[model samples]
Target: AGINYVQNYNGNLGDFTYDESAGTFSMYWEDGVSSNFVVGLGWTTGSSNAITYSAEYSASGSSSYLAVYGWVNYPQAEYYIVEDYGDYNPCSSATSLGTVYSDGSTYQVCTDTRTNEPSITGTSTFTQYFSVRESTRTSGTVTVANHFNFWAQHGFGNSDFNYQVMAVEAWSGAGSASVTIS
Candidate 1:
């Protein structure tokens, strides 16, 4: 009745607390090297519609991003709607496709091709879509529909939904966050 699932990579060290009635969760991490800790709701099939989420976050480390992380079938792709971030920006090197306006904010859109990496379907090659917000903030509402619509226009929207999550990921250092989704 709390968090539905979790993913930990590169030796994650952290604690996660969930409150089902509040629709909220908290995370604390000491370090994970190149690893990331991700946790949230899950489903056999996912959605492309708008999802509203809010969070109180803070971190000091190599990187951290609050996002909607998921996978798709058909075309086999990974997707992320990055609402906020910490030290390192995940979009810095990805190819910038354009921008999307949603929830009263502008998000820079980018795409990357990861070859033979780990995915929901196991080790495989896939395209990754990242919609990174322009300005970072600790707490706010993230409307996911805007980005999905933009991706569809760019040929990245045809895949079948697999599993989706409103996730908090932190890597390389200390991090903490509390999130609520509806």
Candidate 2:
């Protein structure tokens, strides 16, 4: 007896590079940098249909990196804000850190927030909450209201992906960070 099955797959792995001239980072993929499969970091410098990307530092020294997909925005939110001092007076803010397009229409945003509180006893307490709303859309205001508490000890490197993703999941109501479309 013999079994027959057909398998077909074609795609680019993707490439990463640091642009010394632009002092930024970038990713390149097969279908070309704007082929809906590439991820880019830095400023968006192309037509609205072009696969350009950009990132901005939040007021709290955070990075709002957005990755644009087709015509729909992935991750949904444009920014992430961090409040650590128990006061919501803007301790940190991050803007679109990167942008990319999948089908040449949608957009995605990724933002990171940091705390300004100094370390105490070799540790600093930090907390974060997030909210999102579309400037053009009136009924898409998604608000994730929750409080997160963590201790940042001196010499403690930033939290790992597990923790960061946990925060995102809690705030976005999604278990994962990446958004996919069928």
Candidate 3:
């Protein structure tokens, strides 16, 4: 009946709108350190799942990352399958853990550790996994299972699932995105 959302890094520069009937989420941000707005189905497991999305997006400044984002429990982690971006690639500085090929593109896998940061259960430390596409696209299918398998193979222990969403994030930048996820 209504859209589900998780607003991270709340700041004055960010705003959003959601249309549950159409499965669409729109966000506009002028600038901020790290502001994000995400919307999609919630409380889903890490079992086999896939997402198809179409987006119209633009960003300018230091960074922006539009992607399928989510969290997991047990070992605790956050994950992303970045599709579109702004001036900088989010994974540019990180050492590539490896590469994963799926759905007509190759994704550079990277990992990060967050210390005393916001997480699914309030402020806590956790690992962050990323599968940044080599070639960004506005619309496509994300085979999530493949990424999960890739993480598992890379020694990331299996964790209980939390929530998943189509997310628009900006850091030291401004951006806007209108996206439909299914």
Candidate 4:
């Protein structure tokens, strides 16, 4: 419940740090790395399978976004927050799936594939990316059980969930920032 949840970071995360006492993790990345980098805070259960979870958060930085995202080992699925704006993509190829109501509103769901693009864990996972267009949401509550089922609706195979993450992900443009979650 403390900084223990904010334990997973890569891609130049050595440059940033956060507060262990609160979900509003204050971050400071002096600079971005030659490659993309980000840090997350959440409970990732290795035993999770077909999981359901909810999150609430708010964050901002010079060139960063506060978002709810997750990574799975199979198919190497990576889900993206519609509010996030950057080049760090999860799915290698995207097939436009149009719109669907999610998390209380309509979202653009895309059938994202990893046959060509590899995820952080390296899996050719077919993922359904639900994006909330036009909203730079730094604050809100999100439920993702139905969102995961939506992928099954589109024929993306099932997966034994791996990483359920929530945090601030940014490009090098984000020199400094803070992200909060509960």
Model 2 TM-score (2 dp): 0.18
Across 96-118, the per-residue lDDT of candidate 4 in tens digits comes to 66565654566666755446454
Put down candidate 2 lDDT per residue, 4-29, tens digits, no spaces.
11111111333434433443433323
Write out the backbone clash pairs for model 1.
none
Per-residue CA lDDT of candidate 3, range 13-58, in tens? Answer: 5777767666786877755456444444333444446778888888
lDDT for each residue of candidate 1 in 1-182, tens digit (9 for 90 to 100): 23354433332367777665566777877554456567665444667666666788877564887888888886888888887887876568988888888877788898899998888778999989998888766566666666777988877755578777777877667777888776
**Model 4, stretches more than 4 Å misplaced?**
1-4, 11-14, 19-21, 30-33, 46-65, 86-93, 115-130, 157-159
RMSD of 2: 19.2
Give the TM-score comparing model 1 with the true structure, all chains together.
0.86
Q: What TM-score fits each model?
A: 0.86, 0.18, 0.86, 0.67
By lDDT, who's the top model here?
3
Cα lDDT, model 2, residue 122: 30
> What value of lDDT does candidate 3 attain over all alpha carbons?
0.74
How many backbone clashes does every candidate have?
0, 26, 0, 3
- lDDT head-to-head 1 vs 2, winner: 1
